[PDB]
Design an enzyme around this catalytic site. Structure first.
Site, short mmCIF file in Angstrom:
data_model
loop_
_atom_site.label_atom_id
_atom_site.label_comp_id
_atom_site.label_asym_id
_atom_site.label_seq_id
_atom_site.Cartn_x
_atom_site.Cartn_y
_atom_site.Cartn_z
N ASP A 149 0.81 -1.20 0.00
CA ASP A 149 0.00 0.00 0.00
C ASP A 149 0.85 1.25 0.00
OD1 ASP A 149 -2.33 -1.61 0.26
OD2 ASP A 149 -2.29 -1.51 2.34
N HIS A 176 -5.46 -3.81 5.47
CA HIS A 176 -5.32 -3.98 4.06
C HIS A 176 -6.55 -4.67 3.53
CE1 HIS A 176 -3.13 -4.55 0.27
NE2 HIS A 176 -3.70 -5.72 0.27
#
Lengths: 313, 313
Positions: A149, A176
């Site tokens: 990310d 996530h």
């Protein structure tokens, strides 16, 4: 460092293991899977780098894979297909993660444990309750790798502002999965101002990036080559902090105190024994605030499923 | 440098594209294949490095992939199955190489052309003849990549003598198939004296290593991760030499006049326009002088097989 990869024949597992074999920070690389590992090991052993490579196959070879490991990376799991949520992978992957982490609690309880297996938001509470089940749990050494990310956020902010991505660093907190990915664009280095139109578009782009790659790949797996890079970056950061380097910060989904959430990803200062200091959330914008407040219900829900699983298997 | 990878979705192709994406030497990476290249490019474009990534799918988009490239790397080809020899892949890999190099001759004639596609001993002759048909043959810019034999020779000599692979450099000449792979252990840096039986078995290790990995993979392909590594290492030496780094020397199967053999791999000083000086064989021992003698017939046969293929189709 002595690094084990559990699930080394998979899509992530094979390029990740190459990136690790190439590093001078790795002295011994042990590869585990239930199939194909001897072929992958033989292939990798031909690279002219120092890391010794050894492959292991089947459950009875697992202990020897783990003995003396400083770091264990677990990318084992089935990848999503177009249209699935990462949560759709829980029933099939929870069992893999529970099995491999039990063996880590048995044979290398002192190792740094890095979980990539989907869904992180539930597979790290699984790992933690397995370790607690064997009375060897240490919250400072169990990491849910969320580095993809951060790597996405930096490449995308760089693209937009015309900056070198080597120069950009934006913290991503949360978890996530969709809305739980919260990129703290207010905290980005450098600065970057964006109008809130551009800003909500960029945020959604970072939250849905994995899903667009699953779509783009059209049934041929999810992000493997960027996950291998991101996963290798997290291990290299952990190993040179273990080697004494100061000021190494990385975000990771970890046992946390920063919010009402028991697990949460924030910037962590890394040290010789894992997390040295949780840097917390920091000074967030009102937009960033509301994203955290809407994310916590999904996170609470993903965490209790993971916990529940070990409390009945 | 602006690099095209033709055959990017394959076994060698996707980790090779990862290693090129991760280089500061690469500013643009265009990926070509007949299938899956969009998902590979989406995945790779998320990495926080400089090179811009674009995937091209299908013949209609091959010229777009190639325009403006400095270096073209061709991993495309079917891998061996256990029991199959490298010439069993000639009919299938010869037609792929002919097609792609006719596109290269037209669309980027001035680029460096690096051929990995099996069998190199015949595949480089095909590319030469395709370039000559199109009126654009430059013998100093077409390279049959044999760097995996040098990576393997280095890594085997290093473990056998407890040395650090990073400091070992042994010359491998000839071609890339069985008895044509001639490692010149006399010329190794450092000295590494062997008993002659140690020496036979070491040369045997290096000659039949490709088959060993095919056998070890039991049907799942041949060397992919160490070939990605070796392919990447050769491309980086070629870019540094192009950028102006002095004294870059690499062995490669190139059009030669070192022996009475038209194409031969020997050390090459690389420079701004490709091979700057062909360094030749150097000082050899009796044993190496005999290996050349008995490799020259096999090599001459492969070359003529390559040449006659294009003088027909």
């Amino acid at each position: 460092a002595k690094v084990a990869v559990l699930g080394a024949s998979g899509g992530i597992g094979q390029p990740l293991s190459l990136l690790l074999k190439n590093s001078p920070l790795v002295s011994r690389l042990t590869l585990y899977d239930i199939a194909h590992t001897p072929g992958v090991a033989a292939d990798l052993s031909h690279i002219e780098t120092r890391a010794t490579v050894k492959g292991y196959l089947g459950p009875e070879q697992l202990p020897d894979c783990l003995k003396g490991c400083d770091v264990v990376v677990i990318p084992a799991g089935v990848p999503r297909k177009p249209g699935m949520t990462r949560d759709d992978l829980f029933n099939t992957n929870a069992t893999i993660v529970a099995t491999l982490t039990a063996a880590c609690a048995q044979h290398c309880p002192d190792a740094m444990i890095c979980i990539i297996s989907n869904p992180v938001n539930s597979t790290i509470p699984i790992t933690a309750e397995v370790f607690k089940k064997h009375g060897v749990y240490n919250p400072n050494k169990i990491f849910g790798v969320t580095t993809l990310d951060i790597v996405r956020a930096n490449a995308f902010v760089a693209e937009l502002k015309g900056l070198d991505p080597a120069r950009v660093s934006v913290p991503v907190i949360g978890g996530h999965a969709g809305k739980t990915i919260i990129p703290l664009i207010s905290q980005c280095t450098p600065k970057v101002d964006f109008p809130q139109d551009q800003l909500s578009t960029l945020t959604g782009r970072i939250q849905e990036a994995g899903t667009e790659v699953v779509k783009a790949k059209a049934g041929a797996g999810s992000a493997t080559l960027s996950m291998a890079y991101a996963g290798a970056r997290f291990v290299f950061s952990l190993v040179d902090a273990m080697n004494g380097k100061e000021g190494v910060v990385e975000c990771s989904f970890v046992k946390s105190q920063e919010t009402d959430c028991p697990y949460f990803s924030t910037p962590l200062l890394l040290g010789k024994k894992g997390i040295e200091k949780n840097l917390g959330i920091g000074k967030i914008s009102p937009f960033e605030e509301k994203m955290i407040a809407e994310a916590i219900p999904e996170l609470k829900a993903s965490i209790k499923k993971g916990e529940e699983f070990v409390k009945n298997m």
